[PDB]
Structures are given as structure tokens and as C-alpha cells.
């Protein structure tokens, strides 16, 4: 019940998502693993981790107790490698989309720098098991050892909406094409592009979501996209704080998060 431009546009986002989202994480390899002001940082920073091997073996990691020291950072190198893997997917996803690639390159970079975290969280939501509190990433699993944390309330509430793959990819596009981000020059171009992604989403819900439970679903999604933006800003600052006292960000994280390499 969509216009043909609207069906074309979903098809292109779904295609880009299919080509760049490793749902089984098969190619996440060569990552690091745990071995064998700071008042804010302890409050900023756990997760247990499991690795299924190709042979049927399992390794399980239970994190340490907080004891006022360098043990709260032990999982960060591994998360840095996972995040970098996701960001590569995110960047590839954007580069595949015609509307993104028709922009000037300064703006592309600025948009990617502005939304990478948000698109990473949106992809992670689709592998979040809300019944076990576990992110199920192929051979890897990350389980939580409550919902006062705003990122984590977001994941539970987004998962409760039982969204389609098409709605997830439209949410990704809206977040990507956000005219309100630092260094965007084609402000109005991007705003009009965003408007078409949002209207396609509203029309998609209208056509395939007639049940009373999906009343106001478009508006619920748009408000979660807005929450996710404020959460993005907040988590950008947690990262910078922890990065300041215990460096951990990979070169790709540095580029995406503003770190220049010069003290
Ligand atoms: C200091 C820091 C900051 C940022 C900004 C990033 S990034 O986006 O570049 N990456 C990333 C990647 C995945 C994330 C994530 C952030 N948050 C989340 C949201 C879920 C957890 C909600 C708790 C709210 C924040 N509780 C923290 O203390 C920050 C954490 C820093 C790292 C990564 C992640 C687990 C653990 C270690 C705590 C979030 N998941 C989902 C997830 C978590 C664990 C395994 C798989 C997937 C990193 C790696 C570190």
C-alpha cells in the first residue's frame, strides 16, 4: 500500500542490511579476551561472556568483583574489538545506500560520526534475547549478571514492540540521515531525506499493522529514536571519560568519536 518510490526505498535498505549485517558474526575473529575522577569511572562501568567453539567446546567467562582497581577495565579491549567490528558493518551499510552516497563526503563522514553508536545499538537490539538478558552474537554470547540504566531500558522496550526487519532498517536510516548533527553541510538535503524515511515508516506501519496494539506505533518508534539520541550523547561522554584514564579505543573508534591522537 506504499508508493513505488516507498517500496523501492525499503527494498534498498533491506538489501543494504542483508549485505552488511553479519547476523551470525562468522567473520568477527582475532579479537582480544580477558587475561588468565575514577569515582565517576567506577560509576560509569558486569557482563559475562561465552564462546562456543566450532568443535562443540565452550569457554565461559565470569567477571571479577569490583575491588577498587584495574579489573573493571579487563573486558574493554574485547568490547573495543566487537564495537569496531559492528562499526565496519555500519559504515558498509551506509556506503551501500544511494541516498547516502549521493551526499558530499564531508557530510557522509559527519553523519557516520554522528550516528554510528545509534545504528550499532539498533542492530544489537535484533540479537538481544530479552527473556535471558543476553546478546546472542553467533558463537559469542554476552549475558548480564537493573533497568535503571537508560541504554538497557531502551533495549527491553524496543524489543517489546516486536518490530519487522523493515522497521529496524527504516529506524537505522532515520538515525543515519539526521540533519541535526555536527558538521553536516547539506542540512536541508538530509532533512528532506530523513522526512522520506520517516513517512515511508509511517506508511509501512499503516499498511501492515492494522491491529489495535500497533496504534501509535510510528510515534512510539519516533520517540525511541529521540531517546536513543540523548543516550548516544551520554554514552559518547562515558567513553571519553574512560578513554581519558584508561586508553582502549581502537583507531576506528577514535576516528568515529573525535579522538585525534594528539594530547
Ligand atoms: C565505555 C564505552 C562506551 C561506548 C560508547 C562503547 S561503544 O559504543 O563503542 N560500544 C558498545 C557496544 C555494544 C554495546 C554498548 C556499547 N552498549 C551496549 C548496551 C548494553 C549494555 C547497557 C549498559 C549501559 C552502559 N554500561 C556501561 O558501563 C558501558 C559498557 C561499556 C563496554 C561495552 C558495553 C558492556 C560493558 C563494557 C559496559 C557497555 N551494548 C550492547 C552489548 C553489550 C555487551 C555485549 C554485547 C552487546 C564502548 C565499547 C565502551
Numbering used by the authors: 142 to 177, 198 to 206, 210 to 309, 318 to 435
What does the original paper state about this entry?
The difference between the two lies in the size and the chemical nature of the linker, with JMV7035 containing an additional PEG spacer. Only one hydrogen bond is observed to the side chain of Ser247. On the other side of the pocket, the benzyl group is embedded within the aromatic π-trap, which is formed by Phe288, Trp299 and Tyr306.
To overcome this problem, we designed a new PXRLBD-Thb-SRC-1 fusion construct that combines the advantage of having good stability and solubility during purification with the possibility of crystallizing the PXRLBD with or without SRC-1 thanks to the introduction of a thrombin cleavage site between the PXRLBD and SRC-1 parts.
